[PDB]
Amino acid sequence: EKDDKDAIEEKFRERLKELVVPKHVMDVVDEELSKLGLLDNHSSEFNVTRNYLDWLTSIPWGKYSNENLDLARAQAVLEEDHYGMEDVKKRILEFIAVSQLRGSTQGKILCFYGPPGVGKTSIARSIARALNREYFRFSVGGMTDVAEIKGHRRTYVGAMPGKIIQCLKKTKTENPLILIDEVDKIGRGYQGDPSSALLELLDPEQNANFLDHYLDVPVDLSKVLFICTANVTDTIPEPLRDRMEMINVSGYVAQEKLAIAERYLVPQARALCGLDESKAKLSSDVLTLLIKQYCRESGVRNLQKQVEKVLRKSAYKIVSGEAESVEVTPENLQDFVGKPVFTVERMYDVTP
Amino acid sequence: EKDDKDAIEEKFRERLKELVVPKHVMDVVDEELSKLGLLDNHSSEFNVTRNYLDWLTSIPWGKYSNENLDLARAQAVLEEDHYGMEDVKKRILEFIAVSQLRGSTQGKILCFYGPPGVGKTSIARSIARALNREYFRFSVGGMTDVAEIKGHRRTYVGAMPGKIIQCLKKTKTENPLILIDEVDKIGRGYQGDPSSALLELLDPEQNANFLDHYLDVPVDLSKVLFICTANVTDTIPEPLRDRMEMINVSGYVAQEKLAIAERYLVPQARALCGLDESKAKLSSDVLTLLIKQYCRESGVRNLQKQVEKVLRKSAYKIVSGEAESVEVTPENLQDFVGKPVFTVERMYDVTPPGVVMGLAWTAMGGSTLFVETSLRRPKDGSLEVTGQLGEVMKESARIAYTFARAFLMQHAPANDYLVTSHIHLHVPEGATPKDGPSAGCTIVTALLSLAMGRPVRQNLAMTGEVSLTGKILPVGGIKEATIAAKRAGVTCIVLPAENKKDFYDLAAFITEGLEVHFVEHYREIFDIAFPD
Amino acid sequence: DWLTSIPWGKYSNENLDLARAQAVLEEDHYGMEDVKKRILEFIAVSQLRGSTQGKILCFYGPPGVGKTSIARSIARALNREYFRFSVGGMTDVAEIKGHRRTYVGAMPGKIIQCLKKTKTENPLILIDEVDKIGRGYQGDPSSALLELLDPEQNANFLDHYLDVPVDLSKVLFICTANVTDTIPEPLRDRMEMINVSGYVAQEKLAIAERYLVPQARALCGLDESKAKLSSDVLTLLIKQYCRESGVRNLQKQVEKVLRKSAYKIVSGEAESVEVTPENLQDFVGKPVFTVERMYDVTP
Amino acid sequence: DWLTSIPWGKYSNENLDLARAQAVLEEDHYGMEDVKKRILEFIAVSQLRGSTQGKILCFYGPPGVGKTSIARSIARALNREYFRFSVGGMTDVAEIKGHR
Numbered sequence A: 001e002k003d004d005k006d007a008i009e010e011k012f013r014e015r016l017k018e019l020v021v022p023k024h025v026m027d028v029v030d031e032e033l034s035k036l037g038l039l040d041n042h043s044s045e046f047n048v049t050r051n052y053l054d055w056l057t058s059i060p061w062g063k064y065s066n067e068n069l070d071l072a073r074a075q076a077v078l079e080e081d082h083y084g085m086e087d088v089k090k091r092i093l094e095f096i097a098v099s100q101l102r103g104s105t106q107g108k109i110l111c112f113y114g115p116p117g118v119g120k121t122s123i124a125r126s127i128a129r130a131l132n133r134e135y136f137r138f139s140v141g142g143m144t145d146v147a148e149i150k151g152h153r154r155t156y157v158g159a160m161p162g163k164i165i166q167c168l169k170k171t172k173t174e175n176p177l178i179l180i181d182e183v184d185k186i187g188r189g190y191q192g193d194p195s196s197a198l199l200e201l202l203d204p205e206q207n208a209n210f211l212d213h214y215l216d217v218p219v220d221l222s223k224v225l226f227i228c229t230a231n232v233t234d235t236i237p238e239p240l241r242d243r244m245e246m247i248n249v250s251g252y253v254a255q256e257k258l259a260i261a262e263r264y265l266v267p268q269a270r271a272l273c274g275l276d277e278s279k280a281k282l283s284s285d286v287l288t289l290l291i292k293q294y295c296r297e298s299g300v301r302n303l304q305k306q307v308e309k310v311l312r313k314s315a316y317k318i319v320s321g322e323a324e325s326v327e328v329t330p331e332n333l334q335d336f337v338g339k340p341v342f343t344v345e346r347m348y349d350v351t352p
Numbered sequence B: 001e002k003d004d005k006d007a008i009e010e011k012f013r014e015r016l017k018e019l020v021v022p023k024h025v026m027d028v029v030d031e032e033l034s035k036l037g038l039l040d041n042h043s044s045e046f047n048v049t050r051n052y053l054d055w056l057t058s059i060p061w062g063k064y065s066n067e068n069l070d071l072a073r074a075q076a077v078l079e080e081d082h083y084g085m086e087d088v089k090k091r092i093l094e095f096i097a098v099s100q101l102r103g104s105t106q107g108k109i110l111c112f113y114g115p116p117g118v119g120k121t122s123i124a125r126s127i128a129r130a131l132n133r134e135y136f137r138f139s140v141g142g143m144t145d146v147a148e149i150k151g152h153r154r155t156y157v158g159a160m161p162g163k164i165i166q167c168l169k170k171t172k173t174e175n176p177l178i179l180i181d182e183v184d185k186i187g188r189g190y191q192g193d194p195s196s197a198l199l200e201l202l203d204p205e206q207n208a209n210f211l212d213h214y215l216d217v218p219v220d221l222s223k224v225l226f227i228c229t230a231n232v233t234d235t236i237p238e239p240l241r242d243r244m245e246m247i248n249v250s251g252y253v254a255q256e257k258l259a260i261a262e263r264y265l266v267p268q269a270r271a272l273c274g275l276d277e278s279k280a281k282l283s284s285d286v287l288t289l290l291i292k293q294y295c296r297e298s299g300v301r302n303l304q305k306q307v308e309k310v311l312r313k314s315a316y317k318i319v320s321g322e323a324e325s326v327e328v329t330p331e332n333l334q335d336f337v338g339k340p341v342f343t344v345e346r347m348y349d350v351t352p353p354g355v356v357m358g359l360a361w362t363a364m365g366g367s368t369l370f371v372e373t374s375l376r377r378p379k380d381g382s383l384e385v386t387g388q389l390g391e392v393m394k395e396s397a398r399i400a401y402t403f404a405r406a407f408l409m410q411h412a413p414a415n416d417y418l419v420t421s422h423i424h425l426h427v428p429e430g431a432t433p434k435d436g437p438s439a440g441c442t443i444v445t446a447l448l449s450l451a452m453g454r455p456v457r458q459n460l461a462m463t464g465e466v467s468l469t470g471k472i473l474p475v476g477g478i479k480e481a482t483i484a485a486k487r488a489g490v491t492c493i494v495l496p497a498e499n500k501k502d503f504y505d506l507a508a509f510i511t512e513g514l515e516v517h518f519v520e521h522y523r524e525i526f527d528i529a530f531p532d
Numbered sequence C: 001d002w003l004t005s006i007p008w009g010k011y012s013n014e015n016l017d018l019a020r021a022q023a024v025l026e027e028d029h030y031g032m033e034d035v036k037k038r039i040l041e042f043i044a045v046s047q048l049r050g051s052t053q054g055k056i057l058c059f060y061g062p063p064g065v066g067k068t069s070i071a072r073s074i075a076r077a078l079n080r081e082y083f084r085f086s087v088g089g090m091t092d093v094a095e096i097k098g099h100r101r102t103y104v105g106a107m108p109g110k111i112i113q114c115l116k117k118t119k120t121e122n123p124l125i126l127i128d129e130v131d132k133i134g135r136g137y138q139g140d141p142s143s144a145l146l147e148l149l150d151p152e153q154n155a156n157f158l159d160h161y162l163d164v165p166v167d168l169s170k171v172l173f174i175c176t177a178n179v180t181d182t183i184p185e186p187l188r189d190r191m192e193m194i195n196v197s198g199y200v201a202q203e204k205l206a207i208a209e210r211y212l213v214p215q216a217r218a219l220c221g222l223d224e225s226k227a228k229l230s231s232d233v234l235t236l237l238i239k240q241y242c243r244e245s246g247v248r249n250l251q252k253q254v255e256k257v258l259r260k261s262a263y264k265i266v267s268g269e270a271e272s273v274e275v276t277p278e279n280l281q282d283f284v285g286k287p288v289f290t291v292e293r294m295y296d297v298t299p
Numbered sequence D: 001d002w003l004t005s006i007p008w009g010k011y012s013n014e015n016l017d018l019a020r021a022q023a024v025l026e027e028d029h030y031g032m033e034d035v036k037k038r039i040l041e042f043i044a045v046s047q048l049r050g051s052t053q054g055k056i057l058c059f060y061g062p063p064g065v066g067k068t069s070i071a072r073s074i075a076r077a078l079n080r081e082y083f084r085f086s087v088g089g090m091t092d093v094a095e096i097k098g099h100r
């Protein structure tokens, strides 16, 4: 009681006890904390600096998550989570090998580009789990403002800090896996392109000392695995392409689609629909028929919807009591998805 | 002052006892309560602390509405609340069955697209009633600000949480039903692009943790049934289309409209007008007359306004003392609505040579189309196309003209009408813009009919893209085109062979009475259009 | 507190040895004679003056040529405090000038804030991407840059918070821009244009051999004995994979080869990895440029 | 004082008749036969329903057609009290929300 100044100051001080605070950081908080002592609680300025001190203490200075450096363990996780896409797996395996030789955590900037629905975003969660890293996801599609990237001065009311600053606060570590989505369709600001601020984010030389408007102190943005997702590399800004590594995720042939659907899409859809393997069974030819005549695309996003639709209709029959078990065959496939969408492959069988 | 503040603290703490507040939320309450303890009642920031903490306590945490998981009862509610909509009802019934197998409530993203007035918004209320959920509706068409979705910053004066956050308090549950309107009508804006915010809402991975701008805490937006309504799917953004499940609601035929009006539109308008069945009577013939002459849309939105107008005049008549009871017979219908708005169902009752009826599909609904050709002048001929034709539509005319010339050489070698004459092609109603290769085969028939001087078979409507060699390509909006063709009173309809799936997906009564022909090359169209 | 924290008349002990400055500049960068000559002239003039001096310099050229990196080396050679300012896509005018003290929690501009932490009125301010500054309707910080980069008016620089003129002379202002046309004409006139041209294939080999490969090896933790990259292999990589003016693409290709070799050693595939032109395609991928002309004999 | 100033249970008689309501509208304004016919129907349905708040009436048209003066004429027709909720600027806590 009667220790509101002491309680706030002591609580803030305890936060830095378990963090490796840089010299330039805790020097700033000392002049801020001393300002709190000479400030009145009821003052409007008191609210602003208290939030600034809280934001300063929320940053995990020198906090590193215990990463996994076992090549065998990481390879098994990657193989069991996705099919194909050896190029992405090879880069991750080399990343772990480099870290083992380095002896310390490291960060890289990677960009995955390809057709929609080729598991570009899905493997980001798998990689973070394999590397034992915190996962953060946000997109820059249609983004035309710089304030969220950097922040605002403490003078302005409602000064939202940078988005990256938010990532460090919740993840409570300095080595997260931040994914930047839709970097190809970044909004070209009429008054000003926000991609200019993104250059400092993705510049490995400048990640060492990243300055944001709110915190007003550099933050070590290195040792962070930056992953970028895009569809076409042409629309990506030229300066951004230089600092980003291009990794191509190609589409799947009909043979590759069947393997993905049989091993990943169907088992996940069954769990989502709450159906057992014995209750609803989808034969290989039925899945092949769905790929050939119902989903004409490079990805498997459309195939996932069709697979779920068949199981959704099958689940209704089980609950309604029409059939204790449902088995899908090419003859009765129309009872679940209807008439085929793409009944032809080419307009001309014999060219005149 | 402290004693009054103490009571405020106690009553706020009691409210949060029932809610299952998350781990990261209770600490936010504690720090706000601590700040409320040391603040005076007259402080300006006290109101902000008092209001914001009230919002956090008002939003339910872990409270779910008691869902209904009876297939028979839910089906009965859906049937009694709406007519038709078998595809929508099937999906809802499958939604309940999946939840029954899962053993817990779950959420899904659904999209209803079709002509306005079909009942996309009304079925959402029936679904929520059947599912024992809470109904909430908001629109995003022509909306450019993203702050509306997630509110504004707390420190801003006169700032309120977003509509979704506002939804949680009014629904008082974490399992509501949210309806999004005019999704296809959203557009790109300079101030901000809400499409990115909509993508997170409809993404099952992203919506698990939703970040607002007032509460500043993640909210589990999963297990919420998201229903969105649109008119067309082409204008919907590509990333948003993937996250949404497309369900099509089509228009109603004249026999379908009467059933809706007799059972739903008339009783609802009569009830809200304070009248009863005995006092106000609306026969079937007047309802039929209203549909045929006073309405042209594919939906029943305009029909509802006409019905409400009739009851409004009937209510005024009985109140004024003209008659104790009003019967709306066809003889005195003009006293209520006036002269008929539409007197001709089709512009050409009998098509002269060079005139062929076509079919068009829009976001408004199905429509009929006519193509007129005439000799512009009495070494090389030329073709002029008029009307507000798009770039694609104008190109299809060039393809049709080239194929029509080639077809005549192999059919009537002595006929040089198409090569040695200047022909003007016009699509009437020039004010309305037109686009699409849908009328490719119609243009070929019009050119061939004019060249041969033979009128096309009466009550015949055709559609479908035509290639340079004569191949007929499938076209979209078959369901809308067929409904419009039925309204226009056509008997023979020619459709591409690849569109057979869409045509047979229609109801049995819609298909019945129509002589449909499926073709792959224009050579089959020539025999049908010109039997002799 | 803000007024007293300003280092009034505090100057760092600058390094005025030409030979020492020549050696330091060459440790981290190759070529860039025009940039190095300007720095050498800057030191020579300061020695003649007997006192510190400030200049406004702008380096322009193709991206990835070393404009930003050389700035840090220059400060180390000159023994000046290093401060970096980013103005790319920036529209906040108050970040440069400041805000009136009437506003609650008002703060000075970034230039004034830099002087406080530097604790010396003789810093080396680097401004990156002045060409793509934000010329939005909300504000025009480029117009405020004229007072910041005026050689004559820098002696009396006025900021909103302090409301007192501060001697911004004796400060070496370095500006980086990929292109010069987007720079405003009044701002272009005030700054001195220095061109940093790209590197030819012969120059890239010297950069890769002496600066890129040794830095990549330290970054990857791979010794030269374990993985060896010869001149001929490096020449082939530059010839068919890295044809751009900058060396950023070459840095990635060199890193990729060492990265692949590191995995082989870690996985136990090979105790030592030797790279040859035959095996180059396996490590780095498919060649990009293979055909130099599409007509062997012109018809 | 403000609490006691608010009336509770004190309300003037409304919707005295229909013929007098029509006569009031005809004297107040000239023309608007279609508009006056709609108002009579709105009053008639309200009398049948017995509820004052059936639905909100919105008048849209060219400026200067006397849309505002209709509400004053309407209030005299069914013996109500007229008040104008004119808004020129959209502010949350300036007009409706109030203070304290």
Ligand SMILES: Nc1ncnc2c1ncn2[C@@H]1O[C@H](COP(=O)(O)OP(=O)(O)OP(=O)(O)O)[C@@H](O)[C@H]1O
Binding pocket: A205, A239, C028, C029, C030, C031, C032, C062, C063, C064, C065, C066, C067, C068, C069, C070, C176, C177, C178, C207, C211, C212, C247, C248
């Ligand atoms: N001559 C050189 N010797 C050694 N390293 C060099 C040389 N030129 C460039 N580099 C290296 O190339 C990389 C890119 O340099 P830097 O970031 O300074 O380029 P820039 O042209 O200033 O970039 P931008 O215009 O994109 O901001 C750095 O790692 C730098 O060390």
Ligand SMILES: Nc1ncnc2c1ncn2[C@@H]1O[C@H](COP(=O)(O)OP(=O)(O)OP(=O)(O)O)[C@@H](O)[C@H]1O
Binding pocket: D028, D029, D030, D031, D032, D062, D063, D064, D065, D066, D067, D068, D069
């Ligand atoms: N039908 C009418 N009969 C008699 N007087 C009329 C009539 N219409 C308009 N007036 C007169 O003209 C004046 C102008 O109309 P008024 O100011 O009410 O227009 P309004 O519809 O409110 O305009 P705005 O769209 O600009 O808000 C009225 O105050 C009234 O005196």
Ligand SMILES: Nc1ncnc2c1ncn2[C@@H]1O[C@H](COP(=O)(O)OP(=O)(O)O)[C@@H](O)[C@H]1O
Binding pocket: A081, A082, A083, A084, A085, A115, A116, A117, A118, A119, A120, A121, A122, A123, A229, A260, A264, A265, A300, A301
């Ligand atoms: N090889 C694969 N193995 C398992 N699942 C896959 C594979 N390829 C695609 N998928 C599935 O398809 C979906 C593709 O989505 P994704 O491509 O990540 O979206 P985006 O295109 O936005 O990145 C994922 O949810 C993933 O589960």
Ligand SMILES: Nc1ncnc2c1ncn2[C@@H]1O[C@H](COP(=O)(O)OP(=O)(O)O)[C@@H](O)[C@H]1O
Binding pocket: B081, B082, B083, B084, B085, B115, B116, B117, B118, B119, B120, B121, B122, B260, B264, B265, B300, B301, B304
């Ligand atoms: N099959 C039907 N059964 C019952 N009522 C219907 C049916 N179809 C349409 N309606 C009525 O028509 C109206 C259509 O309006 P609404 O669907 O809200 O327009 P929109 O489709 O533009 O949202 C609804 O009020 C609904 O009551």
Ligand SMILES: [Mg+2]
Binding pocket: C067, C068, C128, C129, C176
């Ligand atoms: Mg630079």
Ligand SMILES: [Mg+2]
Binding pocket: D068
């Ligand atoms: Mg007015």
